Structure formats: structure tokens, C-alpha cells
């Protein structure tokens, strides 16, 4: 008869106390789950490493999109990550240009998303009151 689906979505995520979120939850930080797809059945989250986990990425924040639950075999999605500055604008946007293949448990994103030295410097406007606000826009290929 008829059927519908959320096929594009933008998730806004705020990490309080950014300076020591490593102290509070260690090396990895997963967001809460957000939903898309046929009857809200794809479940996703963000995955942050506030300090990158190797020698090339140690000076960076790493940022990934994780597919957490998927009843389907796979899903193909394009994504984009950006930062919400205190002025309110998107900045520092970087996009996957093509779609990548996700299955349950798989992630994709930017091991070197932004330099910790730029981000932590609060004159740059990216950490108002030690809160980092991330934006992830997703578009699932049909």
C-alpha cells in the first residue's frame, strides 16, 4: 500500500568537560544510539577518540560513524562531520564524498579530524564552556 523511511539525518552531539573526558571515560567515547531506516530499524552512533590511538593521530581528535544495529545485510551511506562553534555556525566540515559500506559493528570516519592544539585553544570558538558540539550528516544510498 505505502511505506516510508528516514534516509537522511543530522545528529548533533555535545560532549561536556572536553579537557578531561578521557579521565571520565578513557580512550574511546561512544554516543547514545540514533535511528533511521524501515520502521526506525537502523541504529547508529558516533565514536570519538579525543586523542588519536597511534603515532600519526596522537595530535588529533578522531571521529567515526558506527553502525550499531542492522537487521539488513548491509547499508551504503555518505557522511559529513563538522563542529558547532559558539557563534552557532558549522565549521571544519569534512565529507566522505562517496558512500561507504556499513554492516552491523562497522565504522568509517576521520582518524585525523582536527588538531587538539587548535580545538583546545578556546579563542578559536570551538569549545565554549569546555563543551564540544559535533554535527554528523548522513545520507543512506537507496
Amino acid at each position: 500500500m505505502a511505506s516510508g523511511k528516514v534516509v537522511k539525518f543530522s545528529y548533533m552531539w555535545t560532549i561536556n568537560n572536553f579537557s578531561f573526558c578521557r579521565e571520565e571515560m578513557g580512550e574511546v567515547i561512544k554516543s547514545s544510539t540514533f535511528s533511521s531506516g524501515a520502521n526506525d530499524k537502523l541504529k547508529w552512533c558516533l565514536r570519538v577518540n579525543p586523542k588519536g590511538l597511534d603515532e600519526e593521530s596522537k595530535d588529533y581528535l578522531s571521529l567515526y560513524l558506527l553502525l550499531v544495529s542492522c537487521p539488513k545485510s548491509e547499508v551504503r551511506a555518505k557522511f559529513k562531520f563538522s563542529i558547532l562553534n559558539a557563534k552557532g555556525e558549522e565549521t571544519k566540515a569534512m565529507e566522505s564524498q562517496r558512500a561507504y559500506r556499513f554492516v552491523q559493528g562497522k565504522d568509517w570516519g576521520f582518524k585525523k579530524f582536527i588538531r587538539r592544539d587548535f580545538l583546545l585553544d578556546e579563542a578559536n570558538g570551538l569549545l565554549p564552556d569546555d563543551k564540544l558540539t559535533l554535527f554528523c550528516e548522513v545520507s543512506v544510498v537507496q
Partner: peptide, 9 residues
């Protein structure tokens, strides 16, 4: 300042 390349976990 930012790198464009895309990897899995």
C-alpha cells in the same frame, strides 16, 4: 589542521 582521508576503526 584537518586530514580528509577515511578509515575504519
Amino acid at each position: 589542521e584537518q586530514d580528509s582521508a577515511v578509515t575504519s576503526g
